[PDB]
Write an enzyme that holds these catalytic residues in place. Structure first.
Site, PDB file in Angstrom:
ATOM      1  N   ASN A 126       1.366   5.474  -1.475  1.00  0.00           N
ATOM      2  CA  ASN A 126       0.652   6.731  -1.347  1.00  0.00           C
ATOM      3  C   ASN A 126      -0.225   6.911  -2.577  1.00  0.00           C
ATOM      4  OD1 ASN A 126       0.628   8.656   0.907  1.00  0.00           O
ATOM      5  ND2 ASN A 126       2.859   8.350   0.900  1.00  0.00           N
ATOM      6  N   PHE A 127      -1.537   6.928  -2.346  1.00  0.00           N
ATOM      7  CA  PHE A 127      -2.579   6.963  -3.363  1.00  0.00           C
ATOM      8  C   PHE A 127      -2.590   5.715  -4.241  1.00  0.00           C
ATOM      9  CE2 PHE A 127      -0.214  11.001  -3.066  1.00  0.00           C
ATOM     10  CZ  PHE A 127      -1.015  11.642  -2.146  1.00  0.00           C
ATOM     11  N   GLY A 128      -1.823   4.682  -3.900  1.00  0.00           N
ATOM     12  CA  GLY A 128      -1.858   3.450  -4.671  1.00  0.00           C
ATOM     13  C   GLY A 128      -1.782   2.215  -3.796  1.00  0.00           C
ATOM     14  N   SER A 129      -2.151   1.084  -4.384  1.00  0.00           N
ATOM     15  CA  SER A 129      -1.928  -0.186  -3.713  1.00  0.00           C
ATOM     16  C   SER A 129      -1.685  -1.268  -4.750  1.00  0.00           C
ATOM     17  CB  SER A 129      -3.096  -0.579  -2.815  1.00  0.00           C
ATOM     18  OG  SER A 129      -4.283  -0.646  -3.568  1.00  0.00           O
ATOM     19  N   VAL A 130      -0.993  -2.320  -4.324  1.00  0.00           N
ATOM     20  CA  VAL A 130      -0.644  -3.430  -5.194  1.00  0.00           C
ATOM     21  C   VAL A 130      -1.200  -4.718  -4.597  1.00  0.00           C
ATOM     22  CG1 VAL A 130       1.269  -4.768  -6.132  1.00  0.00           C
ATOM     23  CG2 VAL A 130       1.306  -2.284  -6.235  1.00  0.00           C
ATOM     24  N   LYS A 169      -1.521  -2.983  -9.750  1.00  0.00           N
ATOM     25  CA  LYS A 169      -1.506  -1.703  -9.058  1.00  0.00           C
ATOM     26  C   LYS A 169      -2.761  -0.917  -9.407  1.00  0.00           C
ATOM     27  CE  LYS A 169       1.508   2.062  -7.740  1.00  0.00           C
ATOM     28  NZ  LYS A 169       2.877   2.621  -7.874  1.00  0.00           N
ATOM     29  N   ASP A 209      11.959   8.458  -4.786  1.00  0.00           N
ATOM     30  CA  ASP A 209      11.409   7.699  -3.661  1.00  0.00           C
ATOM     31  C   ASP A 209      12.250   6.455  -3.380  1.00  0.00           C
ATOM     32  OD1 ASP A 209       9.586   7.444  -1.578  1.00  0.00           O
ATOM     33  OD2 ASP A 209       8.115   6.391  -2.817  1.00  0.00           O
ATOM     34  N   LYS A 261       0.883  -1.151   0.000  1.00  0.00           N
ATOM     35  CA  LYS A 261       0.000   0.000   0.000  1.00  0.00           C
ATOM     36  C   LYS A 261       0.922   1.202   0.000  1.00  0.00           C
ATOM     37  CE  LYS A 261      -2.119   0.337   3.616  1.00  0.00           C
ATOM     38  NZ  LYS A 261      -2.864   0.258   4.897  1.00  0.00           N
TER      39      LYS A 261
HETATM   40  N1  LIG Z   1       7.963  -1.597  -4.868  1.00  0.00           N
HETATM   41  C1  LIG Z   1       7.417  -1.419  -3.869  1.00  0.00           C
HETATM   42  C2  LIG Z   1       6.703  -1.317  -2.498  1.00  0.00           C
HETATM   43  C3  LIG Z   1       5.225  -1.804  -2.371  1.00  0.00           C
HETATM   44  C4  LIG Z   1       4.179  -0.720  -2.686  1.00  0.00           C
HETATM   45  C5  LIG Z   1       4.846   0.747  -3.128  1.00  0.00           C
HETATM   46  C6  LIG Z   1       3.761   1.454  -3.561  1.00  0.00           C
HETATM   47  C7  LIG Z   1       2.644   0.389  -3.994  1.00  0.00           C
HETATM   48  C8  LIG Z   1       3.264  -1.041  -3.653  1.00  0.00           C
HETATM   49  N2  LIG Z   1       4.994  -3.158  -2.888  1.00  0.00           N
HETATM   50  C9  LIG Z   1       5.269  -3.639  -4.087  1.00  0.00           C
HETATM   51  C10 LIG Z   1       4.951  -4.976  -4.041  1.00  0.00           C
HETATM   52  C11 LIG Z   1       5.086  -6.031  -5.145  1.00  0.00           C
HETATM   53  N3  LIG Z   1       5.209  -7.294  -4.751  1.00  0.00           N
HETATM   54  C12 LIG Z   1       5.367  -8.283  -5.609  1.00  0.00           C
HETATM   55  N4  LIG Z   1       5.416  -8.033  -6.891  1.00  0.00           N
HETATM   56  C13 LIG Z   1       5.308  -6.781  -7.394  1.00  0.00           C
HETATM   57  N5  LIG Z   1       5.326  -6.309  -8.673  1.00  0.00           N
HETATM   58  C14 LIG Z   1       5.180  -4.990  -8.652  1.00  0.00           C
HETATM   59  C15 LIG Z   1       5.060  -4.574  -7.336  1.00  0.00           C
HETATM   60  C16 LIG Z   1       5.134  -5.732  -6.529  1.00  0.00           C
HETATM   61  C17 LIG Z   1       4.540  -5.267  -2.747  1.00  0.00           C
HETATM   62  N6  LIG Z   1       4.571  -4.146  -2.042  1.00  0.00           N
END
Ligand SMILES: N#CC[C@@H](C1CCCC1)n1cc(-c2ncnc3[nH]ccc23)cn1
Length: 289
Positions: free
Chosen positions: A17-21, A40, A134, A15
């Protein structure tokens, strides 16, 4: 080209900022043979956030590098919005959690391997005039024990043709404890400030993400934990102005800390390049082996 009806929710991965995956399975044949992917999305689809998201998607699509997470496609339902970015799924999570979980089996040579990969990915960003803005171990993902990838680009901006920095000040929390001084004072983001943050990433790596040793904890203890709201930032600026810096991590050799502190130069133009950082990290890693 990804249809929403064929993405199956499995769990949330992260999760921002303004997004989640989300971890999803793309299973268009409905036989549980489809592949797991990362999806995302915006938490609240503001028009401004939607335009930012579109730019982020184009940025990522334009990137192809072993140490950048792979773009796969986009998805949208009920017209055009509900826009979703499809990326490859990286099974070991963020480098922050991954380092925390295996600290007793990841030695300094391995840390420097990760460092070098991060440097090469950042240099690739530089050649496209992209500023990540970032850089943090929480935004590095682990594909396997030998490969990390820069994982999120929600704050990445493209440099103007005529200028070597991008002025932006966003509402929300900003990761002030990874910010270059000129980012805190003037909202100026550059390759050089990406290098500052990389310095912080290297600090993070050699702390092994210990509780009390995070850049926020260290910096709050240097300014006083009482410090009140926006005053925090002000004191941070003053502290960095007087060459207050994060301490050398436990067990960190002098040369590694020196790389950190050369990244933490108040003079933007004296910070090293990512190519030189890679060169030096590789020389140290080859000496250690
Ligand atoms: N970068 C990063 C950190 C984090 C969040 C940052 C803002 C939104 C997501 N985040 C990214 C995954 C991830 N996990 C497995 N595969 C992936 N592919 C693409 C992402 C991704 C899990 N947490």
């Amino acid at each position: 080209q990804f249809e929403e009806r064929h993405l199956k929710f499995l769990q949330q991965l992260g999760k921002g900022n303004f997004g989640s995956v989300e971890m999803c399975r793309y299973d268009p044949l409905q036989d549980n043979t489809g592949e797991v992917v990362a999806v995302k999305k915006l938490q609240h689809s503001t028009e401004e956030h939607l335009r930012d998201f579109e730019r982020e998607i184009e940025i990522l699509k334009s990137l192809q590098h072993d140490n950048i997470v792979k773009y796969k496609g986009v998805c949208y339902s009920a017209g055009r919005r509900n826009l979703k970015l499809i990326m490859e799924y990286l099974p070991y999570g963020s480098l922050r959690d991954y380092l925390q979980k295996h600290k007793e089996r990841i030695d300094h040579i391995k840390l420097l391997q990760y460092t070098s990969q991060i440097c090469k990915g950042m240099e690739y960003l530089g050649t496209k005039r992209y500023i990540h803005r970032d850089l943090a171990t929480r935004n590095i993902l682990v594909e396997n024990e030998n490969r990390v990838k820069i994982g999120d680009f929600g704050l990445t901006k493209v440099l103007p043709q005529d200028k070597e920095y991008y002025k932006v000040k966003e509402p929300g929390e900003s990761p002030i404890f990874w910010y270059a001084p000129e980012s805190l004072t003037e909202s100026k983001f550059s390759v050089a400030s990406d290098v500052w943050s990389f310095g912080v990433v290297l600090y993070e790596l050699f702390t092994y993400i210990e509780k009390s040793k995070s850049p926020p904890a260290e910096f709050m203890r240097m300014i006083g934990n009482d410090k009140q709201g926006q005053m925090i930032v002000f004191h941070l600026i003053e502290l960095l102005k007087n060459n207050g810096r994060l301490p050398r991590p436990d067990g960190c050799p002098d040369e590694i800390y020196m790389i950190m502190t050369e990244c933490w130069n108040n003079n933007v133009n004296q910070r090293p390049s990512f190519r030189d950082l890679a060169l030096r990290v590789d020389q140290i890693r080859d000496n250690m082996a």
